[PDB]
Amino acid sequence: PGFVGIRFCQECNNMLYPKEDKENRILLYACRNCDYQQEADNSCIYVNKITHEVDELTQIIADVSQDPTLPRTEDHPCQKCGHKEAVFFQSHSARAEDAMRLYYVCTAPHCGHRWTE
Template sequence: MEFCPTCGNMLQYELPHMGRPSRFFCPTCPYVCHIETKVKIKKKQRLVKKELEPVITEDDMKNASHTDATCPRCGHGRAAYVQFQTRSADEPATTFYTCLNETCRNKWRDD
Protein backbone atom coordinates (compact mmCIF):
# COMPACT_ATOMS: atom_id res chain seq x y z
CA MET A 1 0.00 0.00 0.00
CA GLU A 2 1.22 3.45 -0.87
CA PHE A 3 -0.06 6.69 0.55
CA CYS A 4 -0.12 10.20 -0.89
CA PRO A 5 2.68 12.37 0.54
CA THR A 6 0.51 15.47 0.07
CA CYS A 7 -2.82 14.56 1.67
CA GLY A 8 -2.21 11.10 3.20
CA ASN A 9 -4.96 9.24 1.32
CA MET A 10 -4.32 5.77 -0.03
CA LEU A 11 -3.12 5.84 -3.65
CA GLN A 12 -5.00 3.95 -6.33
CA TYR A 13 -3.36 1.90 -9.09
CA GLU A 14 -3.97 2.68 -12.77
CA LEU A 15 -3.00 0.26 -15.56
CA PRO A 16 -0.84 1.44 -18.49
CA HIS A 17 -2.95 2.98 -21.25
CA MET A 18 -2.00 4.12 -24.78
CA GLY A 19 1.73 4.41 -24.18
CA ARG A 20 1.39 5.87 -20.69
CA PRO A 21 3.13 3.77 -18.00
CA SER A 22 1.24 2.34 -15.06
CA ARG A 23 0.98 4.66 -12.12
CA PHE A 24 -0.33 5.36 -8.66
CA PHE A 25 -2.60 8.38 -8.35
CA CYS A 26 -4.35 10.14 -5.52
CA PRO A 27 -8.16 10.34 -5.92
CA THR A 28 -8.40 13.64 -3.98
CA CYS A 29 -5.39 15.69 -5.07
CA PRO A 30 -3.33 15.92 -8.30
CA TYR A 31 -0.43 13.71 -6.99
CA VAL A 32 0.74 11.05 -9.48
CA CYS A 33 3.60 8.54 -9.11
CA HIS A 34 4.70 6.72 -12.29
CA ILE A 35 5.86 3.11 -11.85
CA GLU A 36 9.02 1.92 -13.58
CA THR A 37 8.54 -1.26 -15.56
CA LYS A 38 12.01 -2.60 -14.75
CA VAL A 39 13.15 -3.47 -11.27
CA LYS A 40 16.82 -2.84 -10.56
CA ILE A 41 18.59 -4.92 -7.95
CA LYS A 42 21.18 -2.67 -6.44
CA LYS A 43 22.96 -5.07 -4.14
CA LYS A 44 22.94 -8.81 -3.73
CA GLN A 45 23.46 -9.98 -0.20
CA ARG A 46 24.19 -13.55 0.70
CA LEU A 47 22.30 -14.87 3.67
CA VAL A 48 24.50 -16.42 6.32
CA LYS A 49 23.00 -19.30 8.21
CA LYS A 50 23.20 -18.57 11.89
CA GLU A 51 24.60 -21.31 14.09
CA LEU A 52 22.02 -22.42 16.60
CA GLU A 53 22.91 -22.91 20.21
CA PRO A 54 21.46 -26.12 21.63
CA VAL A 55 18.83 -25.75 24.33
CA ILE A 56 20.21 -28.75 26.18
CA THR A 57 24.01 -28.90 26.15
CA GLU A 58 26.25 -31.91 26.65
CA ASP A 59 27.15 -30.55 30.11
CA ASP A 60 23.46 -30.56 31.07
CA MET A 61 23.19 -34.20 30.08
CA LYS A 62 26.38 -35.16 31.99
CA ASN A 63 24.83 -33.81 35.19
CA ALA A 64 21.41 -35.29 34.39
CA SER A 65 19.68 -38.17 36.17
CA HIS A 66 19.77 -41.67 34.68
CA THR A 67 16.85 -43.99 34.13
CA ASP A 68 15.93 -47.35 32.62
CA ALA A 69 14.68 -46.08 29.24
CA THR A 70 15.19 -48.06 26.04
CA CYS A 71 16.83 -46.21 23.16
CA PRO A 72 14.65 -46.40 20.02
CA ARG A 73 17.74 -46.54 17.76
CA CYS A 74 20.10 -49.05 19.38
CA GLY A 75 17.96 -50.68 22.09
CA HIS A 76 20.34 -49.77 24.95
CA GLY A 77 18.55 -49.91 28.32
CA ARG A 78 19.96 -46.78 30.05
CA ALA A 79 19.49 -43.09 29.25
CA ALA A 80 20.13 -39.70 30.84
CA TYR A 81 17.12 -37.43 31.06
CA VAL A 82 16.19 -33.82 31.75
CA GLN A 83 12.65 -32.45 32.15
CA PHE A 84 11.45 -29.02 31.02
CA GLN A 85 8.06 -27.35 31.11
CA THR A 86 7.62 -26.59 27.39
CA ARG A 87 3.86 -26.05 27.37
CA SER A 88 1.35 -24.44 29.71
CA ALA A 89 1.50 -25.15 33.42
CA ASP A 90 -1.45 -27.54 33.43
CA GLU A 91 0.26 -29.81 30.85
CA PRO A 92 2.88 -32.41 31.82
CA ALA A 93 6.59 -31.63 31.43
CA THR A 94 8.54 -32.78 28.36
CA THR A 95 11.31 -35.30 29.06
CA PHE A 96 14.45 -35.16 26.90
CA TYR A 97 16.55 -38.34 26.79
CA THR A 98 20.10 -39.08 25.65
CA CYS A 99 21.24 -42.67 25.15
CA LEU A 100 24.17 -43.60 27.40
CA ASN A 101 25.62 -46.01 24.83
CA GLU A 102 28.93 -44.34 23.80
CA THR A 103 28.56 -45.35 20.14
CA CYS A 104 24.92 -44.23 19.83
CA ARG A 105 24.31 -41.01 21.84
CA ASN A 106 20.82 -40.78 20.28
CA LYS A 107 18.58 -37.95 21.52
CA TRP A 108 14.80 -38.21 21.74
CA ARG A 109 11.95 -36.74 23.71
CA ASP A 110 8.80 -37.90 25.39
CA ASP A 111 5.92 -35.39 25.51
Protein backbone atom coordinates (compact mmCIF):
# COMPACT_ATOMS: atom_id res chain seq x y z
CA PRO A 1 0.00 0.00 0.00
CA GLY A 2 2.50 2.62 1.15
CA PHE A 3 1.80 6.14 2.36
CA VAL A 4 0.61 9.03 0.20
CA GLY A 5 2.49 12.31 0.06
CA ILE A 6 1.19 15.85 -0.18
CA ARG A 7 1.38 17.46 -3.62
CA PHE A 8 1.30 21.20 -4.24
CA CYS A 9 -0.16 23.39 -6.96
CA GLN A 10 2.09 24.49 -9.80
CA GLU A 11 0.86 28.12 -9.62
CA CYS A 12 0.19 29.06 -5.98
CA ASN A 13 2.38 26.34 -4.39
CA ASN A 14 -0.46 25.46 -2.02
CA MET A 15 -1.36 21.86 -1.28
CA LEU A 16 -3.61 20.05 -3.75
CA TYR A 17 -6.72 18.58 -2.21
CA PRO A 18 -8.50 15.49 -3.57
CA LYS A 19 -11.57 15.86 -5.76
CA GLU A 20 -13.66 13.61 -8.01
CA ASP A 21 -14.70 14.39 -11.59
CA LYS A 22 -18.11 12.83 -12.23
CA GLU A 23 -17.93 13.64 -15.95
CA ASN A 24 -15.04 11.24 -16.56
CA ARG A 25 -15.50 9.42 -13.21
CA ILE A 26 -11.84 10.04 -12.38
CA LEU A 27 -9.75 11.24 -9.46
CA LEU A 28 -8.30 14.75 -9.64
CA TYR A 29 -6.05 16.79 -7.34
CA ALA A 30 -7.19 20.41 -7.30
CA CYS A 31 -6.13 23.56 -5.46
CA ARG A 32 -8.75 25.38 -3.40
CA ASN A 33 -6.73 28.62 -3.67
CA CYS A 34 -6.04 28.81 -7.42
CA ASP A 35 -7.93 26.98 -10.20
CA TYR A 36 -5.34 24.28 -10.94
CA GLN A 37 -6.17 20.61 -11.43
CA GLN A 38 -4.07 17.50 -11.98
CA GLU A 39 -4.66 13.89 -12.98
CA ALA A 40 -3.79 11.66 -10.03
CA ASP A 41 -1.45 8.71 -10.58
CA ASN A 42 -1.77 6.72 -7.32
CA SER A 43 -5.60 6.57 -6.90
CA CYS A 44 -5.08 6.28 -3.09
CA ILE A 45 -5.97 9.28 -0.93
CA TYR A 46 -5.24 8.19 2.65
CA VAL A 47 -3.28 5.45 4.39
CA ASN A 48 -3.20 4.64 8.11
CA LYS A 49 -0.71 2.04 9.35
CA ILE A 50 -2.34 1.14 12.66
CA THR A 51 0.10 -1.74 13.11
CA HIS A 52 2.95 0.79 12.65
CA GLU A 53 5.09 -1.76 10.78
CA VAL A 54 7.92 0.74 10.30
CA ASP A 55 11.36 -0.40 9.15
CA GLU A 56 13.54 1.39 11.69
CA LEU A 57 16.59 0.75 9.50
CA THR A 58 15.35 3.72 7.48
CA GLN A 59 15.42 5.91 10.60
CA ILE A 60 19.04 5.00 11.37
CA ILE A 61 21.84 7.12 9.90
CA ALA A 62 25.40 5.92 9.36
CA ASP A 63 26.82 8.89 11.27
CA VAL A 64 25.81 7.17 14.52
CA SER A 65 28.84 4.91 14.03
CA GLN A 66 30.96 7.88 15.18
CA ASP A 67 29.39 7.81 18.66
CA PRO A 68 31.99 6.90 21.33
CA THR A 69 29.21 5.93 23.75
CA LEU A 70 27.73 3.18 21.56
CA PRO A 71 28.93 -0.41 22.00
CA ARG A 72 31.06 -1.99 19.30
CA THR A 73 31.32 -5.65 18.35
CA GLU A 74 33.66 -7.72 16.19
CA ASP A 75 31.27 -10.69 15.93
CA HIS A 76 28.90 -9.29 13.25
CA PRO A 77 30.90 -8.33 10.14
CA CYS A 78 29.42 -6.07 7.50
CA GLN A 79 27.77 -7.77 4.53
CA LYS A 80 28.38 -4.78 2.24
CA CYS A 81 32.07 -4.02 2.94
CA GLY A 82 33.45 -6.82 5.13
CA HIS A 83 34.54 -4.55 7.98
CA LYS A 84 34.74 -6.46 11.25
CA GLU A 85 33.84 -3.80 13.80
CA ALA A 86 30.28 -2.51 14.01
CA VAL A 87 28.27 -0.47 16.49
CA PHE A 88 24.98 -1.83 17.78
CA PHE A 89 22.05 -0.29 19.61
CA GLN A 90 18.40 -0.86 20.44
CA SER A 91 15.35 0.83 18.92
CA HIS A 92 14.75 3.22 21.88
CA SER A 93 11.80 4.55 19.82
CA ALA A 94 8.27 4.96 21.13
CA ARG A 95 5.46 2.86 19.62
CA ALA A 96 7.88 -0.11 19.48
CA GLU A 97 7.19 -2.64 22.23
CA ASP A 98 9.56 -5.42 21.10
CA ALA A 99 12.39 -2.89 21.28
CA MET A 100 15.09 -5.21 22.64
CA ARG A 101 15.91 -5.88 18.97
CA LEU A 102 19.45 -4.84 18.03
CA TYR A 103 20.35 -2.74 15.00
CA TYR A 104 23.92 -2.82 13.70
CA VAL A 105 25.87 -0.23 11.74
CA CYS A 106 29.24 -0.62 10.02
CA THR A 107 31.97 1.62 11.43
CA ALA A 108 33.95 1.71 8.19
CA PRO A 109 33.95 5.30 6.87
CA HIS A 110 31.86 5.96 3.75
CA CYS A 111 30.26 2.49 3.95
CA GLY A 112 27.71 3.14 6.69
CA HIS A 113 25.78 -0.04 6.01
CA ARG A 114 23.02 -0.74 8.53
CA TRP A 115 21.31 -4.05 9.23
CA THR A 116 19.60 -6.24 11.83
CA GLU A 117 20.05 -9.81 13.03
